[PDB]
Subunit: 344 residues, 4 copies
Amino acid sequence: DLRIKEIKELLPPVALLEKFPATENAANTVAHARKAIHKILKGNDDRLLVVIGPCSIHDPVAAKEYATRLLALREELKDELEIVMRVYFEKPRTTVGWKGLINDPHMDNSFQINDGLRIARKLLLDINDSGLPAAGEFLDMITPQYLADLMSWGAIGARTTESQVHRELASGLSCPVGFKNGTDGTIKVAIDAINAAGAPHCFLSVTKWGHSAIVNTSGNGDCHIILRGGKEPNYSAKHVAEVKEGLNKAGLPAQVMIDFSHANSSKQFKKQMDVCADVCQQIAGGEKAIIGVMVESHLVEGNQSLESGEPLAYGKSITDACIGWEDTDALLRQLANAVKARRG
Amino acid sequence: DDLRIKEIKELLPPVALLEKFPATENAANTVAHARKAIHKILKGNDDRLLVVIGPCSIHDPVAAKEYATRLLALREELKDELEIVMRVYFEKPRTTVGWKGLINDPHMDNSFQINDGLRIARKLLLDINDSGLPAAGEFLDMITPQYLADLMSWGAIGARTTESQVHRELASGLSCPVGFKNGTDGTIKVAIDAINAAGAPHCFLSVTKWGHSAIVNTSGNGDCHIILRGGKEPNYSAKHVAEVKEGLNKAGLPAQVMIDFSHANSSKQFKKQMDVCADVCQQIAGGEKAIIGVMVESHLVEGNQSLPLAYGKSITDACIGWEDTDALLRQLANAVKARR
Amino acid sequence: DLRIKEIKELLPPVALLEKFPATENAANTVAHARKAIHKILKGNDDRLLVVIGPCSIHDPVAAKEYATRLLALREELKDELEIVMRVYFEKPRTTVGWKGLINDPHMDNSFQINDGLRIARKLLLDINDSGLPAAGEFLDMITPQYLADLMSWGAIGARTTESQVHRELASGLSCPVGFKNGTDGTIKVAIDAINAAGAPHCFLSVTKWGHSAIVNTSGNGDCHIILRGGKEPNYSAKHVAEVKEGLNKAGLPAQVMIDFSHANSSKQFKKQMDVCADVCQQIAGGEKAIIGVMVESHLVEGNQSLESGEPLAYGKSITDACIGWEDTDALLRQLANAVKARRG
Amino acid sequence: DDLRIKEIKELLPPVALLEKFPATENAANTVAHARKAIHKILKGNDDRLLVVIGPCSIHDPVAAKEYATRLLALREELKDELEIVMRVYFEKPRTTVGWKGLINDPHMDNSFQINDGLRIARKLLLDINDSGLPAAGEFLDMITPQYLADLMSWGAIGARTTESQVHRELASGLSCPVGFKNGTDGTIKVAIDAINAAGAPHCFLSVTKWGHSAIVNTSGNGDCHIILRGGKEPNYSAKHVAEVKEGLNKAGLPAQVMIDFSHANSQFKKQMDVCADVCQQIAGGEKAIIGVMVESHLVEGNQSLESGEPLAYGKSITDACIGWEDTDALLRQLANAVKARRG
Ligand SMILES: OC[C@H]1O[C@@H](O)[C@H](O)[C@@H](O)[C@H]1O
Ligand SMILES: OC[C@H]1O[C@@H](O)[C@H](O)[C@@H](O)[C@H]1O
Ligand SMILES: OC[C@H]1O[C@@H](O)[C@H](O)[C@@H](O)[C@H]1O
Ligand SMILES: [Mn+2]
Ligand SMILES: [Mn+2]
Ligand SMILES: [Mn+2]
Ligand SMILES: [Mn+2]
């Protein structure tokens, strides 16, 4: 082990589950949201799943204010929207940068992972306990053991849709799971992923106790595609119809989640509003295959760079740029009205 | 919690397999020598060719040992041209579902006797290395590596996981050199990004030799390289090799490549492997120095079969047989002779 | 494992440490009480260490009511007495019986030890946070990692004083440790234990992660004897003189803690008051060797049987009989008066 | 706080030693048959005598295997009268300090190479059982047994821990029979309590074969008995045996004893005198004596490890033992006393 420079103690998941147990409210929130999303995926509910929130969480105070504002819209638009808050801790990049809230909660490159896990789990508990469901991103096979019991929906990392170990992971998760399409806009890997995750699997994994074990999963039938764009945006009606034809040819439900950001928005946060406009039209004219959307959203629009010896703007992303609260309110109201038009 | 987790069973920790199956002196010397040789080839201070060759997947230790005894003869004969390393792959990534290799399911009956699989796999790897033959594997599983990596002289991150951050992290901490396949579509960038990440230090969650999760800090691995394995069309041609060399130079990496003759470079047809050998041999005989290694899917008997089984025949991808193997290795040795 | 019927999961110490961390005041209570006892054992404080409280804890509610009453007397008498509450979670039996709160918190042979550890640590934390230090018998080889950081003083029981694993345990404990003499009255085993515990040791133990490990200890110089009687009581001046000589002969300071209960009362709880009368007269008369006493004390006197199935009376021991609160108050004032007269 | 904890180092979990040194078929058969034979002697359906004999402590695996081969000859030959089991103890519980034994200090230099020592001790136990000779251990810790107890056909709880609840818990869950030494006052009440305690089921914390702590439940071990080892005076006479028997009957326990010829009942050669008295009792019809314990080595006596001089071969570095010639004689005497008791 000449390339392993140090090994350091890691709190076991049981220690974070005992320090931060789900309240009865928190567990009810997760349970209710997982069932609602399942009913939507089965086609038995016609509401739209909306996953919306910051690119990444770097400040629990701002995240709790965001959650309060979002929860108010969630109660008001519940007839049309199943609103879930995006609670992502890290923005994966090949480029250098902040490794996110779990790795580096103090944002200073100290890799204080035990602190990060405590802060992240406590934030998830508080949001769920307030009544707002949470959506997560699964980047690795160890982190989910500390947090997934507070997640109502998750996304597998776009760079690991094709990976057997991430698919094995999805097949045993208690929540619905979204797989992003290919970076060139094709959907073949994502369909392979939905199929693989829907099968039972046996593989190695760390347990709640911090020990590796052999685990058997049931398979996960609540997996769906996330359209995030290829070279160009792929949110249009032509693209949606192509993806629906692929999903039918593959014997899968012809339903999609559309990610309004990044490639689909051309990497300018404001263009999420344009994607909204298009997708709302598709929903208002009777598109039932669009069962969800994902939006990058924060209190304060835009973004900022993390800098040594310097304070940061409150509520503003330190990773990718997000729409701010005003646009977020308008966007949610637009989608709600679109869901209405489609129904009567 | 755990409504899709059906069962949780005990798993031997790496320390028990390391204690049951300690490296002999001979196995350890084999691994060290082979790592130094591949490092020398990668530093450019050796004109020989790294040849990673053998079954697509191990599924029968007895046939594997016959193949190794046969391959060891040629490794010895062709020492001055080739650094021959046997494919000993215990883990197989599926396009969707299927048999995942000896470790996951040694009895090939969906009994998933992974403690058995680890015992069998380690014993096989130890005997091979102990006979003097170095070994190569794909590192797919995040947990299994600690049971075997000390007996591995070279590793691969598959095409379907080259883009994975956890695999890049694992590579940053391995004691052996590592090849990264190109993407399934043929994309070269993902692999260049993996090489850059694997050479950097990382800090991440992982599992110790005691079976416990821990925080690990790695040093970074400078001995990583790309493996051309094809996309929609093959990418072994001199044109593709030139393009990849220009990409590596742009990325500030050494302009060096290993060429996988199988998978999408052979269009999943085992005989095209000899066709690619012919084409690749020409590049090497004409002075191409950027080709530092190749990989070939080879077995005792050619072709493949579905999962009693036929002896010497692959139960995953189709392989060339022993006779075409001998001929291929001699073709590569001759091309190396000519290059210098 | 033919005689092993079942193996069940156990929360690791870090889980209990994370769920119930020491407050600042709890940690201050432990640090100050250990320092004050060390000062007494070094000869630099003339006050009396008093370890007093229930034979066993079986009910947090009565334990906390008790703690409030004792805290008020610790505050009023602290110029004379260092009062430390008996908070015993583990009981050694002559053959079989209820082993205490941790082993069987619901007192019904359901052995819900994970519950018992949660209950026990929460209670220890509440008592220390209130300002009252706590004493415990260290019987089990695994439980200490869940509690020792909240213990200001520990006892190795008469039945285990001779035990090498218990001496090793003591050699690595952060708190002072008393060794009872043997059940037949033998003094030499406690003297040997003190000497063994003062040396460093290397032995197998379990870590805060719940894994077995090799540990090295520094040795514990804050060990002393506890006189608990034998076939006959051994609290009297004749016996104290013999023990001081025996300690000096073995190169140990002539210092003793006197247990008023167990064999020194012939298991008759009211006689603790007679032991008290005699020891107070020793202390008031000038006996410096008596640096501590121990007393079995509860809200209500006497004891009661678990086996009858009757609902338990409040504040009343289910193990050895104890003096009630009124006797306890009179006893603590007697001891404080004796210490004052010893100084005068 | 951990002020008095200087260092924490890695420990192989039992599964690692079990995987490196698995029981052969022969070792397993030896353990099973010896345990069943001792159960039959304790239930009173075999008239043979349990003989636990061998070095006070094992410090040299080579010498132990030679003694084991020598004793194995005597086992087969006297097998109709005696169930011979080798004493394979790794340490001498020492009043307060000294050489700590093979598991702690296999290299005998205070380097505490416990992982080495566990390997060496499991390998020794495996080889001895595999050859056909059962082995007897002393259970001092609650972690060591997990590495070794499957290769043990009988065990003793140390006299300094007979009273200890945690060692009684351990006994209640052991797969082999267990003896409890008397106290030191030569009294038997703590040992009677230990047999009653260990006979009951318990629930308690223990370390598993995976090296993790867990909650275990046990069934209770009905195969426990007393060992008479003396105190300030020897307790091996027929008078003492009669007192112990009335005490066990009064407590509702089977009236049977094991007599330890050494220690306080002992002067290593006085063990030969205790054999002399014990044989007279057994020949004269004493059924209650179901076993004996004898400290024996290749070479009689003992010797000091803190001298700086090379140790003699096959000679104890702890308590003094009888040597091989006296060992053959004692065993034949016991076989003859058992013959006289029977026919
Ligand atoms: O500081 C929180 C910020 O939230 C924004 O959405 C809002 O426009 C700002 O006025 C400010 O309240
Ligand atoms: O949240 C912890 C995770 O952090 C990621 O950045 C990393 O890729 C994983 O290996 C894991 O350590
Ligand atoms: O066999 C190892 C044992 O060694 C003993 O000397 C010690 O008292 C035990 O704690 C245990 O470490
Ligand atoms: Mn983003
Ligand atoms: Mn293949
Ligand atoms: Mn009591
Ligand atoms: Mn001895």
